[PDB]
Enzyme design. Structure first.
Site, mmCIF file in Angstrom:
data_model
loop_
_atom_site.group_PDB
_atom_site.id
_atom_site.type_symbol
_atom_site.label_atom_id
_atom_site.label_comp_id
_atom_site.label_asym_id
_atom_site.label_seq_id
_atom_site.Cartn_x
_atom_site.Cartn_y
_atom_site.Cartn_z
ATOM 1 N N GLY A 11 12.050 5.883 2.796
ATOM 2 C CA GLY A 11 10.788 6.910 1.762
ATOM 3 C C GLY A 11 10.399 7.696 2.229
ATOM 4 N N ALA A 12 10.887 8.673 3.280
ATOM 5 C CA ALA A 12 10.185 9.618 3.547
ATOM 6 C C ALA A 12 9.773 10.560 2.122
ATOM 7 C CB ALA A 12 10.975 10.571 4.601
ATOM 8 N N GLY A 13 11.079 11.026 1.523
ATOM 9 C CA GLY A 13 10.771 11.631 0.169
ATOM 10 C C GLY A 13 12.064 12.729 -0.286
ATOM 11 N N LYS A 14 12.800 12.453 0.752
ATOM 12 C CA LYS A 14 13.996 12.912 0.338
ATOM 13 C C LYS A 14 14.755 13.715 -1.080
ATOM 14 C CE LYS A 14 16.510 9.951 3.722
ATOM 15 N NZ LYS A 14 16.039 9.058 3.296
ATOM 16 N N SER A 15 14.528 12.429 -1.352
ATOM 17 C CA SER A 15 15.528 11.933 -2.447
ATOM 18 C C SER A 15 14.690 12.678 -3.461
ATOM 19 C CB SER A 15 16.179 10.525 -3.443
ATOM 20 O OG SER A 15 16.305 10.086 -2.001
ATOM 21 N N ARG A 41 20.098 -0.201 -7.826
ATOM 22 C CA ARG A 41 18.451 0.111 -8.072
ATOM 23 C C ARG A 41 18.143 0.233 -10.056
ATOM 24 N NH1 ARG A 41 15.880 4.042 -3.752
ATOM 25 N NH2 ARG A 41 16.193 2.211 -2.032
ATOM 26 N N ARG A 134 7.778 1.378 -3.588
ATOM 27 C CA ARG A 134 8.910 0.926 -4.512
ATOM 28 C C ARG A 134 9.006 -0.079 -4.706
ATOM 29 N NH1 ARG A 134 12.746 5.096 -1.676
ATOM 30 N NH2 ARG A 134 13.584 2.653 -1.501
ATOM 31 N N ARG A 145 14.039 -1.162 7.835
ATOM 32 C CA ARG A 145 14.490 -0.110 7.676
ATOM 33 C C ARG A 145 13.315 1.041 7.989
ATOM 34 N NH1 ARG A 145 16.687 2.444 2.166
ATOM 35 N NH2 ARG A 145 17.993 1.491 1.533
ATOM 36 N N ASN A 168 5.800 15.162 4.473
ATOM 37 C CA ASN A 168 6.010 15.450 3.305
ATOM 38 C C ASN A 168 4.298 15.243 3.066
ATOM 39 O OD1 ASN A 168 6.282 15.287 0.833
ATOM 40 N ND2 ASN A 168 7.895 12.991 1.323
ATOM 41 N N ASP A 169 3.556 16.094 3.312
ATOM 42 C CA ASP A 169 1.996 15.093 2.578
ATOM 43 C C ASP A 169 1.584 15.853 2.045
ATOM 44 O OD1 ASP A 169 -0.630 14.713 2.585
ATOM 45 O OD2 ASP A 169 -1.076 15.468 4.363
HETATM 46 N N1 LIG Z 1 4.286 12.959 -1.521
HETATM 47 C C1 LIG Z 1 4.540 12.281 -1.387
HETATM 48 N N2 LIG Z 1 3.450 11.117 -1.731
HETATM 49 C C2 LIG Z 1 2.673 9.954 -1.572
HETATM 50 N N3 LIG Z 1 4.261 9.353 -1.614
HETATM 51 C C3 LIG Z 1 5.774 9.964 -1.592
HETATM 52 C C4 LIG Z 1 5.486 11.323 -1.543
HETATM 53 N N4 LIG Z 1 6.915 11.709 -1.670
HETATM 54 C C5 LIG Z 1 7.684 10.025 -1.879
HETATM 55 N N5 LIG Z 1 6.817 8.801 -1.274
HETATM 56 C C6 LIG Z 1 6.924 7.864 -2.037
HETATM 57 O O1 LIG Z 1 8.139 7.401 -1.250
HETATM 58 C C7 LIG Z 1 8.947 6.700 -2.786
HETATM 59 C C8 LIG Z 1 9.796 7.679 -3.041
HETATM 60 O O2 LIG Z 1 10.311 8.385 -1.924
HETATM 61 P P1 LIG Z 1 12.145 8.895 -1.851
HETATM 62 O O3 LIG Z 1 12.830 9.694 -1.664
HETATM 63 O O4 LIG Z 1 12.763 7.831 -2.791
HETATM 64 O O5 LIG Z 1 12.574 8.201 -0.236
HETATM 65 P P2 LIG Z 1 13.562 8.394 0.583
HETATM 66 O O6 LIG Z 1 12.725 10.141 1.772
HETATM 67 O O7 LIG Z 1 14.898 9.465 -0.461
HETATM 68 O O8 LIG Z 1 14.263 7.824 1.331
HETATM 69 P P3 LIG Z 1 15.413 6.556 0.672
HETATM 70 O O9 LIG Z 1 16.681 6.304 1.749
HETATM 71 O O10 LIG Z 1 15.944 6.514 -0.733
HETATM 72 S S1 LIG Z 1 14.420 4.436 0.876
HETATM 73 C C9 LIG Z 1 7.438 6.234 -3.237
HETATM 74 O O11 LIG Z 1 7.367 5.508 -3.296
HETATM 75 C C10 LIG Z 1 6.614 7.016 -2.945
HETATM 76 O O12 LIG Z 1 5.642 6.712 -3.295
HETATM 77 N N1 LIG Z 2 25.623 7.945 6.021
HETATM 78 C C1 LIG Z 2 25.526 8.369 5.733
HETATM 79 N N2 LIG Z 2 23.865 7.973 4.766
HETATM 80 C C2 LIG Z 2 23.818 7.583 3.987
HETATM 81 C C3 LIG Z 2 24.509 8.370 2.839
HETATM 82 N N3 LIG Z 2 23.759 8.098 1.676
HETATM 83 C C4 LIG Z 2 22.811 7.653 1.934
HETATM 84 N N4 LIG Z 2 22.430 7.392 2.646
HETATM 85 C C5 LIG Z 2 21.416 7.126 3.425
HETATM 86 O O1 LIG Z 2 21.288 5.814 4.022
HETATM 87 C C6 LIG Z 2 19.718 4.963 3.550
HETATM 88 C C7 LIG Z 2 19.870 4.703 2.675
HETATM 89 O O2 LIG Z 2 19.816 5.036 1.412
HETATM 90 P P1 LIG Z 2 19.061 4.195 -0.284
HETATM 91 O O3 LIG Z 2 20.252 3.700 -0.506
HETATM 92 O O4 LIG Z 2 17.844 4.034 -0.294
HETATM 93 O O5 LIG Z 2 19.591 5.312 -1.159
HETATM 94 C C8 LIG Z 2 18.701 6.657 3.222
HETATM 95 O O6 LIG Z 2 18.767 6.685 5.436
HETATM 96 C C9 LIG Z 2 20.221 7.231 3.582
HETATM 97 O O7 LIG Z 2 19.536 8.959 3.423
HETATM 98 C C10 LIG Z 2 26.131 8.534 2.962
HETATM 99 O O8 LIG Z 2 26.470 8.701 2.432
HETATM 100 N N5 LIG Z 2 26.354 8.113 4.500
#
Ligand SMILES: Nc1ncnc2c1ncn2[C@@H]1O[C@H](COP(=O)(O)OP(=O)(O)OP(O)(O)=S)[C@@H](O)[C@H]1O
Ligand SMILES: Nc1nc2c(ncn2[C@@H]2O[C@H](COP(=O)(O)O)[C@@H](O)[C@H]2O)c(=O)[nH]1
Ligand SMILES: [K+]
Length: 192
Positions: A11-15, A41, A134, A145, A168-169
């Site tokens: 949920g940080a926002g790396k995707s 999903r 989400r 998580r 990620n503000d």
């Molecule tokens: N800059 C931001 N400000 C507010 N909410 C954010 C921001 N970036 C992401 N989000 C929230 O985070 C979610 C999408 O972020 P993702 O990139 O999917 O999460 P993630 O960091 O990739 O972790 P996972 O492994 O995918 S659950 C949504 O619920 C967005 O509302």
């Molecule tokens: N070690 C490892 N972690 C992963 C891989 N793919 C996704 N993840 C991690 O698994 C978690 C769940 O990912 P999500 O199911 O939300 O996409 C996140 O922390 C993500 O970074 C992978 O291939 N290897």
């Protein structure tokens, strides 16, 4: 030109930052499509977001040695396959990965020689709201998580583990800090 490893709490926002990077810099970066055992999903496409395989397929591939690294997260298997990285290399692109903390340390053991960036929440409080927005996580999986997030946040301060930590503000600001951190990476890629 080194590979890029993005990590951080769920949920940080790396995707999100990765998707913005991969659209604006399609000719420079190539996303590493990992394998996963969890269900797709809504809006997720097999082959792009993940290689969605069953538990038996994942374990069969692990025995076959198809994975550079693999780990379990919230009762589901994830893994960076060799073919996923070699596919990006065959396209003459910088491979970008999205793994957990366990994968980060596993990648540290490999020879991929990446640059490690940790996308961090402004605080753990806003992370829950980000995860609750989400809605893809049930209340039980959300707690798992969230619990693992604090361990990831604590390890992000470990000296030498991550090259860049991005808070990620502001999404535009976070993406601006992502591009600047990759300035020499993008420069070297375009320098050939
Ligand atoms: N800059 C931001 N400000 C507010 N909410 C954010 C921001 N970036 C992401 N989000 C929230 O985070 C979610 C999408 O972020 P993702 O990139 O999917 O999460 P993630 O960091 O990739 O972790 P996972 O492994 O995918 S659950 C949504 O619920 C967005 O509302
Ligand atoms: N070690 C490892 N972690 C992963 C891989 N793919 C996704 N993840 C991690 O698994 C978690 C769940 O990912 P999500 O199911 O939300 O996409 C996140 O922390 C993500 O970074 C992978 O291939 N290897
Ligand atoms: K991934």
């Amino acid at each position: 030109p080194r590979p890029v490893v993005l990590s951080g709490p769920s949920g940080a926002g790396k995707s999100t930052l990765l998707k913005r990077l991969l659209q604006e810099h399609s000719g420079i970066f190539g996303f590493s499509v990992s394998h996963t055992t969890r269900n797709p999903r809504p809006g997720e496409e097999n082959g792009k977001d993940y290689y969605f395989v069953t538990r038996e397929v994942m374990q069969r591939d692990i025995a076959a040695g198809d994975f550079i690294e693999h780990a379990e997260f919230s009762g589901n298997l994830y893994g960076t396959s060799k073919v996923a990285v070699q596919a990006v290399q065959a396209m003459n692109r910088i491979c970008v990965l999205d793994v957990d903390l366990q994968g980060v340390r596993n990648i540290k053991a490999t020879d991929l020689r990446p640059i490690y960036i940790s996308v961090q929440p402004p605080s753990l409080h806003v992370l829950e709201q980000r995860l609750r927005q989400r809605n893809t996580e049930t209340e039980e999986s959300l707690v798992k998580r969230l619990a693992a997030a604090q361990a990831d946040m604590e390890s992000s301060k470990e000296p030498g583990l991550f090259d860049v930590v991005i808070i990620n503000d502001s999404l535009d600001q976070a993406y601006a800090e992502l591009k600047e951190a990759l300035s020499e990476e993008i420069k070297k890629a375009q320098r050939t």
